[PDB]
Amino acid sequence: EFFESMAESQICKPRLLINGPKGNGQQYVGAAILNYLEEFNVQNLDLASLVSESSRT
Amino acid sequence: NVNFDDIGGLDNYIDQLKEMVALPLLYPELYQNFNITPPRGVLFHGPPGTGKTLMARALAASCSSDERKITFFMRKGADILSKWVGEAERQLRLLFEEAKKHQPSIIFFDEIDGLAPVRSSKQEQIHASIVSTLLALMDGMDNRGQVIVIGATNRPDAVDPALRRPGRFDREFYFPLPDVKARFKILQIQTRKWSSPLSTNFIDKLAFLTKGYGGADLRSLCTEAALISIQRSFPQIYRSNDKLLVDPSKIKVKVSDFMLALKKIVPSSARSTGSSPQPLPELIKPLLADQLNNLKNKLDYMLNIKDTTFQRNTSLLQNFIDYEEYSSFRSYEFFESMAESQICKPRLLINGPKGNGQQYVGAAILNYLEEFNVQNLDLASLVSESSRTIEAAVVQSFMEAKKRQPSVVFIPNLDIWINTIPENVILVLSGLFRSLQSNEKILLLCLAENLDISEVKNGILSDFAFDKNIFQLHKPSKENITRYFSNLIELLKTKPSDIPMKKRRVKPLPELQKVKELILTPEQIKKVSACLIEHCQNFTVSQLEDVHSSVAKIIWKSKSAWDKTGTVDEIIKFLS
Amino acid sequence: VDMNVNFDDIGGLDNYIDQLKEMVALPLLYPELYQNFNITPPRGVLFHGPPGTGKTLMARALAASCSSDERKITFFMRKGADILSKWVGEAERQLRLLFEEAKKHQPSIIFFDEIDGLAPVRSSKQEQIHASIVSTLLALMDGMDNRGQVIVIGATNRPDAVDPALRRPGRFDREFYFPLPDVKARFKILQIQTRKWSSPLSTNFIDKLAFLTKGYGGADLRSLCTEAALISIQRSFPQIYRSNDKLLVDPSKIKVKVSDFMLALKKIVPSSARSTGSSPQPLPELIKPLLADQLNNLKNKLDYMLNIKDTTFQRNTSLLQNFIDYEEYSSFRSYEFFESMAESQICKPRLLINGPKGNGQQYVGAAILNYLEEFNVQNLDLASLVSESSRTIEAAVVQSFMEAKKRQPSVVFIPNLDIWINTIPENVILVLSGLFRSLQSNEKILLLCLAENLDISEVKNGILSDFAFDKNIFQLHKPSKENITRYFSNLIELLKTKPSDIPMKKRRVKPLPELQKVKELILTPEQIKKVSACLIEHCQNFTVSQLEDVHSSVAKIIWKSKSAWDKTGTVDEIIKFLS
Amino acid sequence: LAENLDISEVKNGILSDFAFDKNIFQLHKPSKENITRYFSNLIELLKTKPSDIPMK
Ligand SMILES: Nc1ncnc2c1ncn2[C@@H]1O[C@H](COP(=O)(O)OP(=O)(O)O)[C@@H](O)[C@H]1O
Ligand SMILES: Nc1ncnc2c1ncn2[C@@H]1O[C@H](COP(=O)(O)OP(=O)(O)O)[C@@H](O)[C@H]1O
């Protein structure tokens, strides 16, 4: 209960915002990062994936 | 099969269901004497994996299945309705006549939401005919026979309101997620037919750890723990392609297997949005225990949770079996009117700075109120379902709170809730709360991060009467921060010989038959604590957790080192 | 669902029993009277009302009561839309056979339960499967050939879902509204359900149950009686709930007591509480000293607006009994003139109750709705309008007002008018006002609105100006000194009670038998007077909500020391609280 | 049918294209003779006998 707690307390609030100039290879950086985290469970929140389904708002 | 002893908790419902299925055939003369008919129809509602189907099957195959056998028909709401235009009503009629010929019968409609939903959408008119035929077929006061209709659902407000009347489903039974005692009983039930039954302290700790688990999650946890024990005790039987390496049973399911089963099995309470009801985590407890207890005292004053000597609602059959009865008239209604006169208007508004552990305080408070009917008005709990609008969802949540009287209308993130939730529905909720009687036990719990008080007294929340019941969450004191940052130190002071690392075995796995001291002076510890407290001055829980995580990474990176001078130096450098 | 019921089982619907006799039993025995005028008896009645009012019981009693002589009345009963199958043939073919076999056994009664599913309204899409059923039903019920002595009875929750072509003479010429029983009908139903019991209840206890069961239907009353009997069985012989073998018990000394009915009262929730509107219930006994002084005034005002106590005309509870006990007595100048001058007494029934914030309006509204027992309450509050997500605000308002137009004695109820005129769209109020001004003056549709701190300027020259709230504004003023004195006098009566009086339940010395298987209270009156004075002074110019808060806070203190005999501690705590 | 409808709305407003030019009928309040007949009908109830009233 102590060691699992202290190993699990190593993630506080994982956030990251990659911001750069216009057209500075963001579309490749995102793909490369999502490939680096291939063992995760990626949930895209882009516009194309939300307005694709006409039933759900 | 399943008897009543395979069911954890729900003893109230165990006794109450025996007066409509078991006693009516066992004692025909005590019911014919009063010219009464059993209710004949129940609505089980609750979170998935709580034991509604298990209740039904035990109920059918437990009440005297010797000469007066009770047949059991299992149907699902989505099963009855088909792609045709008259198939499903005919199927319902066939099912009911079939149950009629086998007169003592129990028809179990699992997930009756699909068969008969609420009338707010779904044109093409077939569902209206379905609801009408279900309403007409399950008439409970014309002696259709001895058919008991049991309908299972997640939440009863998703079922057609015409079905929740006498004759149709009479009694509604809430199947909650088990508490500590019920989880203990369920774990004992699941670990009863083992060859090496677990101890009592083991099961107690497991019940403590399994927070936000259901019956199905507990069964899966037990099964996976057993599987891991077989995987570990005799691992040669997997990779070897040879014949049976027979092995007897020295298998003992110990802690290190249940703890992996815990992290591999995900509970069904991890899917619902909002704050899952669970106590404060052991890490943050020193930061928020003292302020939580005060809240409990407040919740113990405005709700009468401790001094509930007149409202001790358990199986009243038990009350009759171990108590005895007693002008004689006044002593009932006078004292009963003066007993509900203590609850006047239960309101509470927890308001603190941003990130001050409100998601923990709300969950802990809800875990305190386990006997209440929590109706979550959270953002994701209303916008998730597309079958209802926000207005209707809020009104139905309020009215289900109103029906099951001990209830808590819970609104996490009130600051967001008063901006992205239109003023119309907020005024509707205000009018609904203004039409309640004072002696109604509906607590309005709200947790807001940096809410303005002028909003409470002059804004749109002015008609909710949050005038005196505003509890202010404040940032933890220096003493609490000292105790919070007193487990990293105990991780800085543990030598690498006590960290559960992995070391390869020098000898290979056998096969069966073919039939120092750590260099860290107390001055360094004192300096580390002094800097760790000086950096965290007037901090919130989120910021303290950030500092805790960033220091724990540093401590754990140098976990095999025996001279912590470098780790202490790095810790002081980061907090500078 | 065939027999063993009769018309003495039915309670509170004596007016419809006479007409059902007039259409079923009377033509059989006297065919010369009907053939004297060359008239055919009305055939087919549509029962509609709140669920659990007695429609199916009424149909079964009709089937089994007129068949007591040697003139059998076969009862063909059809559940709602159970006749349509996956193909296109049997839906009409089976109705054909039903009506032919009804013709064969000429005196017969077809009962379509939940007919709103068998004959839906013609929607935009999915026409065929229900239109092909409605058309054939219309064809057989009023075909060219004489259907015969077949009485068609339909039952529904609401009649608007039945096709209007069915609601036509020759098919459903009579529509019977089954209302929620009043106090007399509830008394009769309770007497009927507790008639076969071995130890009958007293008359005054049944009267008190009838008063306490406001909002219940017939089904709710039956469920309450069943629950009381079950509690009595649990209280007398708990042991049968533990053993799996049939123990030997005696159907004696299992008499039902008041305590069992009281528990069943909390175990049973009525259909009034399931609804989203304000449940009409009397003033709770605690607040009665505070509000009943100014509630009676409202009653008096209502007595002068709806002519409740002056009922000489439109006293139609039962026409047949009226012809039996009363006696008749140019023609126009003796009936039309006096009927017109009697209905000329209701001009425009309106009433706006407006008091300070928290002055017990949710209580006065329920009390008023309880006083108007014979009125049809329609709730226009926000919750009822927004509860049906398929409907719109305007559509719900129009539906409520049109429902109120039929069943003429009715009340359009708008609790929380201050909220209502701020969260409703501006055009809905105009639609409702246009509906109200499109009414005749002599129509008894009372507009009762309760508002908290509503500005009179909004009624004088605002959006509520076209509702005519001129003289019908009643101000709920804050309670006076004597009402507060009575409230806290009841509180003090609770304070000065002995612990031997306060009901603590028991701890039985001996276990239940197995069954054979087959000090002095010290409280000076000076302290009581001091506490009363402090309570009176602290609640100066208080509303009902603040008084209830003070009452609850002091009751917590009093109930804390419910066993202590030295009540000086509770007294000084009470005094310290009010400071 | 309208109550207190300003004619500004009907010769130059939204309803001006419905051609309500000379077809506007004005309902005026009842004159003294009408009120006299109404209240004579009312008073005739005061003159009726208690035994003449259709009290069943
Ligand atoms: N209260 C309980 N006590 C013991 N076991 C339970 C309980 N509730 C659920 N279970 C376990 O979960 C399974 C029941 O699942 P099910 O009845 O389908 O859940 P639900 O009815 O909530 O969908 C059974 O195999 C049973 O072993
Ligand atoms: N007016 C009444 N008089 C006597 N009993 C009634 C009355 N109304 C309802 N009941 C009781 O309620 C029970 C169920 O009524 P039901 O036929 O289900 O009504 P509905 O069809 O309107 O739901 C009946 O068994 C009957 O005993």
Side-chain angles (χ1 to χ4, degrees), chain D residues 2-56:
Chain D
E3 333 190 29
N4 236 12
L5 198 62
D6 43 349
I7 312 304
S8 86
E9 249 293 343
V10 300
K11 85 213 86 55
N12 90 10
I14 331 170
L15 304 153
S16 82
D17 53 338
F18 277 122
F20 286 115
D21 41 358
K22 73 212 63 172
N23 298 299
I24 304 205
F25 190 78
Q26 231 53 31
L27 266 171
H28 33 73
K29 316 164 161 181
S31 43
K32 256 189 59 182
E33 278 49 14
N34 296 338
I35 291 137
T36 313
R37 223 162 307 81
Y38 197 47
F39 289 151
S40 88
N41 192 10
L42 168 68
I43 276 169
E44 207 249 23
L45 189 70
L46 182 58
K47 295 192 303 182
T48 205
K49 301 188 73 53
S51 43
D52 183 18
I53 295 199
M55 190 284 293
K56 40 192 52 173

Side-chain angles (χ1 to χ4, degrees), chain B residues 39-46 112-113 116-119 131 134-136 138 141 149 151-174 373 375 388 392-393 395-405, chain C residues 51-52 157 219-220 223 267-276:
Chain B
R40 309 202 170 295
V42 199
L43 189 76
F44 296 169
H45 61 78
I112 211 165
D113 224 340
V118 77
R119 277 146 152 157
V131 165
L134 199 60
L135 264 206
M138 74 197 262
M141 281 156 258
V149 190
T153 181
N154 276 314
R155 20 157 301 173
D157 40 357
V159 185
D160 185 47
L163 285 151
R164 306 166 55 189
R165 81 173 203 67
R168 334 282 181 260
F169 304 134
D170 297 343
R171 316 203 277 221
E172 281 56 20
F173 293 159
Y174 179 61
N373 172 36
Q375 293 292 327
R388 274 181 321 160
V395 169
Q396 302 224 20
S397 307
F398 183 87
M399 283 266 164
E400 266 53 60
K402 194 181 164 53
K403 288 169 195 177
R404 261 170 319 161
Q405 197 38 73
Chain C
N157 210 154
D220 309 274
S223 199
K267 249 194 283 158
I268 286 325
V269 86
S271 280
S272 171
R274 324 211 181 251
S275 308
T276 174

Side-chain angles (χ1 to χ4, degrees), chain B residues 18 80 155 226 272 366 399 410 431 467 497 540 571:
Chain B
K18 275 166 77 178
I80 274 301
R155 20 157 301 173
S272 86
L366 282 195
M399 283 266 164
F410 180 47
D467 66 335
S497 315
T540 57
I571 273 174

